[model samples]
Target: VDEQPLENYLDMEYFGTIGIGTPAQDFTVVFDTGSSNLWVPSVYCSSLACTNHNRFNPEDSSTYQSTSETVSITYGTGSMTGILGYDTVQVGGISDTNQIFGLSETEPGSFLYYAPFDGILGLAYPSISSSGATPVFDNIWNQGLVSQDLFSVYLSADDQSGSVVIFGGIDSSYYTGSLNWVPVTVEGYWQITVDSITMNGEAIACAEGCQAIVDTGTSLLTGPTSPIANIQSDIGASENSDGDMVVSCSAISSLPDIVFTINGVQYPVPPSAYILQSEGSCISGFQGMNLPTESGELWILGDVFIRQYFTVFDRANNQVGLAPVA
Candidate 1:
């Protein structure tokens, strides 16, 4: 009866609680839009990452059905190798029976070991789903569990509360001003056309028309290597020994806002928003990501941007709606 409240993990990731199986084994999950799949650590997994987190036990669930199909998922920092299975999935208040999801056998990385969430629930298109498994959101629509054919996300800033990802409806109270709807440039990844990226009314990256993926799975705003380097230097951020861009926490007060114009609307990300401050250290929220040319310079609008604007992914209309978070 209530919206799925998400925990903002150090402004790095947002996750919510969900239930699986007949008896409802509870697990915290990241509602990621970058990938298509639903997965959690299984009892069979012996990795420290899996052992440290909650794992699904098929024997404990009356509704569980095992499958021979296995899965492997790779992220920017971590990866999961797992097998497939069918069970009832509970999200918010909706229940979808016979839902296909992964059970990680091994989560190989320090990233997963330190991750706040145990699993990920993908909200992107099924077209990109590995192993041809039907996506959770697709199953939500296929079974007519959702009232509408869209979902909206509101990610809170830093560790403040009030973050939620509501399926099938958009709550106007979560955002300010009217929604700015942008047509999805591609069928997958919630891709949209971003006119230009600017600073102080001057053009920076994405000078020409560019495509950007609104990815909730990613923590930082990502673009090409060279342009991102320029943006970092221009903002007085220096690269640390580990190659991470770090800005002087002292100069954060004097920094300017970087704006992104999309579909003729200006969305400004202020210095405090783009620069992530933690424990007396400040890191630039912009990172370099090198992707294929087929996408034509893709920029990922991660939590850094989504924290500034509430985002909606519409499956029925194939559009993304943006409104500043209230």
Candidate 2:
């Protein structure tokens, strides 16, 4: 299995370096499993967001090709408008030729400008791609770059090391006990069924059932605004001047575990796992986000929840695997 080591950025995002075009121009990217398109800053970008990140100069690569196709994407906080093209893309020890990707000519938002990384490389199904362009993972699988049609992610803790994304296989050493699998209800964004969310033997939210997306691109455990706000209040979290729900750092010891049940298994995330601590300050990891859909409540299990669990995205069987982290 080929593994790309990732750097944990302030416990918010984990990113790694990837190469594009001939001689492989290096660019730091977030390996986001939530989206389906890969994009980086380009020389054509005239936006303020491009100035801080590495820009892809097409003139430096001999194998790069330009396309007339254009793409526009809107994220939870940021957006990008760019032109499409084809080139060679490399991650870890795997490289795929003629890979279709986006060149950001306009990244409009403070999110991308203040971000530590240069670009984002998505790994979700191609059905959700912005343009008709083929996804990088689809091309990798179609070209037989990997033996298994699966990938695993191990996101380490804050200010720590050992984060890695393994393409084509699983590294069991990063997890403990056995792996639990849940069938993917939708292919668009790794959508799955979450049984319920509980705390201290009582149901806090999603008591019946809910839909969730296990997204590495997301930073917090997001759900409906009211429910998430309730969790904040129930946990004694108060809104700070920065508009963040914060908690007393010393109170974490008495906090109850927030348990998540999926596929008949209960995964407990302790206060130490959900409460983010840094520089003598602590903040609640729960956030309110209203992603209303036709299919019940939608929750996003992002890095905050993922830091306590090991996740495996299986394309071969259209299921997601979760296991206790080592």
Candidate 3:
């Protein structure tokens, strides 16, 4: 029954505030599905990333407890090394006592320093957690804080706000149609199989079966070199010096919708969703990132896809459901 309204930042990252410790210290964090370890800057952290953001002081919290264990987690952009600690964590009306989390003392990179949020609350499965800490959602389900072991996300468009994340249930008001259920292909990272990707009804990427990770932490839609390169070329986009694909803003209206097929259902990314206008220029939201797996290169459907559909992550049945937003 807990629902937290998400705030969208420049249409790039969406985050919400959560309270941690005895005299609840509130911090804004990205509820990420790409990783599975909740971490925030600690009082011991001296890095520039922690200077401007909210830092957790264990001494100030009566419920704080320290563990002998330590952790180091790496992401595509940066890494964080920290100590393991336990405290009371709460989001909305749901509370988890003795929730294990990380207090980063060394967050090494501009990625964290320049981020809009103070920390990240990972929602991925525990199998991918670097610190082996129980995820907040898992704790909610285990403690019977929610009626179901599921959560849903609704991300708003760039021009608007009022996005939300619902734990333990779905909100029919956020979505228009029935949910299209898709089975999870893997237990880690919300992995699912995408049938194919098309442009104007023609297959452009993932012609065969392909694995995709639904990551809310990522800002853009990322795929392998070949498919993404082809997509940019087909759309008459040119890569700039910064590696972003740029197109004339005038052409955005004529662009065709890119469709992704999953579980026999078609999800389309309209021209407005694929092209981002910033500083008098339009940039393609689809970027090339190499994420090779045993099966093939992995495709990441990030905020670009989530903004178009309300997504549901059902842990009890190991499935994901998508529905168009109202």
Candidate 4:
């Protein structure tokens, strides 16, 4: 029912603006698939991060309703403590009423400082919501705002533009060929099973089997230390002072394409998609990060991978679909 344009910030993060409350106060938010809580800094917050960004004032909206329940959510690098609230949320032209969301009064960490977005609009399943609040997408489906309980993402390359998020339907113009559907391995995250990771036709990682989360919130493709370290070494990259792998920008053209086998289909990430260029330097888009779960360590296919493929999150089928860009 709604199609929103997303701005890619340095190809690291993508965000879009959404309206909330009766008068439609606009706020920029990151559409994240890794978590399931819609939260924004509140006017009540005094944190330095909140001061620099837009804050939601409940009193300013006639439709705003406050709840006594409090919620706290933790991320990989930051945390937020807030009270629950209800209001109307609007995206594109579609609006949902009585949407349960968080009004962050306390946001702590450097992660919030550098982020350009004022809030995060999580698209993952409601089961993962720290506040146990119904997700925005769920409300859209329940309200019959969309013909389909699905959304798709098209992230353009760093050098190009035209990134977008389409809710309630898929845009065939953004992708080529048929979509390959992969069943969700878990109900919480948009997780799927990856057969293997290969480079130059040889298996280098995830050979045994691995659960992978397709996270749009994350900036880089990350995996367990050992596998990612091996990838770094193969690419002739070394960790810099900031713990990011730095490589010569000139060598990117010579680097091999890294391929991921998902649902028996090959998804290749070319060097241009894996090497980030900035300030006369190139950083490997693949990083070493531990995402331990009860099932085992999970691999995160972030922007680096998502940019190379058009992604569809199908809630009705509980599956993820990936296709090459047209």
RMSD of each: 1.5, 1.2, 1.2, 1.3
TM-score of 2: 0.97
Clashing pairs in 2: none
TM-score of model 3 vs. true structure: 0.97
For residues 237-295, could you state the per-residue lDDT of candidate 2 as single tens digits? 99888887889998789989999999899999999988889767888888898897776
lDDT of 4 by residue, 237-261 (tens): 9978887689999877798899999
**Candidate 3: lDDT of 66?**
95
Candidate 3: C-alpha lDDT: 0.89
Cα error, residue 216 of model 3, in Å, equals 0.9
Give the per-residue Cα lDDT of candidate 4 at 31.
93
lDDT of 3 by residue, 265-292 (tens): 9998888888888968998888998886
TM-score of 1: 0.96
**Error of model 2, residue 243, in angstroms:** 2.5
Cα error, candidate 2, residue 238 (Å):
1.4
Expressed as tens digits, the lDDT of each residue in 123-228 for candidate 1 is 9999888798899989989998888999999999868998988889999998999998999988778899999989988888888878899999899999988889
For model 3, the superposed segments whose C-alpha errors exceed 4 Å read: none
Of 1 and 2, which scores higher on TM-score? 2
